[PDB]
Amino acid sequence: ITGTSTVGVGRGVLGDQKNINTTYSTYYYLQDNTRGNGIFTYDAKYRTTLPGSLWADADNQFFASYDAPAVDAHYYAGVTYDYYKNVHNRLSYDGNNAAIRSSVHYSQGYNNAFWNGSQMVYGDGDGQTFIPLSGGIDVVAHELTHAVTDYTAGLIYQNESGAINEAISDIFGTLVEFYANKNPDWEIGEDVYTPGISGDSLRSMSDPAKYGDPDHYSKRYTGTQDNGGVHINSGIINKAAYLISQGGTHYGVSVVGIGRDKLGKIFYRALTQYLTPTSNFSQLRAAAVQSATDLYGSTSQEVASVKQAFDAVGVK
Ligand SMILES: [Ca+2]
Ligand SMILES: [Ca+2]
Ligand SMILES: [Ca+2]
Ligand SMILES: [Cl-]
Ligand SMILES: [Cl-]
Ligand SMILES: [Cl-]
Ligand SMILES: [Cl-]
Ligand SMILES: [Zn+2]
Ligand SMILES: [Zn+2]
Ligand SMILES: [Zn+2]
Ligand SMILES: [Zn+2]
Ligand SMILES: [Zn+2]
Ligand SMILES: [Zn+2]
């Protein structure tokens, strides 16, 4: 909508206060004109119709419980935009400043959130398994990173390529969480999963086996469920990424950590320059090695650590 750029204030799903970029035209709308072609957040009103109505508020204050999922969807879309722009010089998910649209209050008791090819969609959760899922910045950036993948490598959502697709989203979801300083960690979904249980998450990148996901190629899932284990076998790549960044000894292989920024540069270059729709784990290793070689030189610590990390998780 046309109007004046304003700055409102509200509280997110977890009760935290934050400013949000809005647009004033009689009402204050969740329309952020400061990021690309805009960030737009919508009320789906518990329906499955999308996108719903552009979110309108009378006073530019967003402290009602019903407001909280919209506050976070809007703000964390903005943080994800800022990460890709400031860290990777990537403008929105398509690199051409595409508008980022999000709908909250999708369906009823819906324990999921997803990029649907054109926009983000957030359920509210059932209040036991999930609270409104836009409250998790790693979930927001995980799903928006699926869009980045769709506009770059095009990894297919099955078997090893699909597990890479998932791990790329967990890696950059986590790097966005660190970039925001939103109580970062190497867990996924901890802020919105199981409000009655502290200290858990959907999956762990530092210790995938905590939740029964594999942390070594020899423990990969080979059945047909979950599109060939895409949310399971991602643990193998997530652990490799954790080791590249933080270092450690894993199955007797010592990995010298190189930090989060270099992990992100290596995997972003692999994703945008070298991966293809059918890249498998071995080809991801090759792409990460080549990407680190491009960035740091073939004799660098960074290349050596990439090789160590993939050795540690049994990927040659
Ligand atoms: Ca209000
Ligand atoms: Ca997290
Ligand atoms: Ca929990
Ligand atoms: Cl560990
Ligand atoms: Cl471990
Ligand atoms: Cl470790
Ligand atoms: Cl170990
Ligand atoms: Zn998803
Ligand atoms: Zn995903
Ligand atoms: Zn966290
Ligand atoms: Zn998923
Ligand atoms: Zn280990
Ligand atoms: Zn470890």
Curated annotation (Swiss-Prot):
- UniProt cofactor note: Binds 4 Ca(2+) ions per subunit.
Residues involved in Ca(2+) 2 binding: D138, E177, D185, E187, E190
Co-factor requirement:
Ca(2+); Zn(2+)
How do changes in temperature affect this protein's function?
A: Thermostable.
Question: Which BP terms from GO are recorded?
Answer: proteolysis
> What's its EC?
3.4.24.27
- The name under which this protein is listed is Thermolysin
Species source reads: Bacillus thermoproteolyticus
Q: Its encoding gene is what?
A: npr
